[PDB]
């Protein structure tokens, strides 16, 4: 972020999760980040689609 | 050994394009991480065209 938090940075949760998952793409499958992510997140939706 | 250093080469543009999509989808007001992430990386995928 920028020094002096007057210039607000918006981290609505997805941002930190996104970073974690972007590390997942980078660490697990460096050449193709997206194919891994797509499979991982489709698997995510598959395994856990929000049920209330 | 002589080689073996994990030289994680991340292709630039991954971030840039999924950034365009992140800001756009955030503007779309995404529901949950599952659908958010699926479409997000899917948008890169849609732009790259895995099928033709």
């Amino acid at each position: 972020g920028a020094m002096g938090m007057s210039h607000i940075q918006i981290p609505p949760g997805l941002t930190e999760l996104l970073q974690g998952y972007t590390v997942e793409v980078l660490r697990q499958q460096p050449p193709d980040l997206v194919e891994f992510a797509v499979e991982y997140f489709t698997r995510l939706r598959e395994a856990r689609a929000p049920a209330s | 050994g002589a080689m073996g250093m994990s030289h994680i080469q991340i292709p630039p543009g991954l971030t840039e394009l999924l950034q365009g999509y992140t800001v756009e989808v955030l503007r779309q007001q995404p529901p949950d991480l599952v659908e958010f992430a699926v479409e997000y990386f899917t948008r890169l995928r849609e732009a790259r065209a895995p099928a033709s």
Binding site: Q9, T15, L18, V23, L26, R27 | S6, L18
Partner: peptide, 28 residues
């Protein structure tokens, strides 16, 4: 004053760059 566009860009940028730095163990 800051925008989603630029922060989101920063966030994805720093994670890829820094996680790349993690490959060497920059995190120490």
């Amino acid at each position: 004053r800051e925008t989603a566009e630029e922060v989101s860009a920063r966030i994805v940028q720093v994670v890829t760059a820094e996680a790349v730095a993690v490959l060497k163990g920059e995190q120490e």
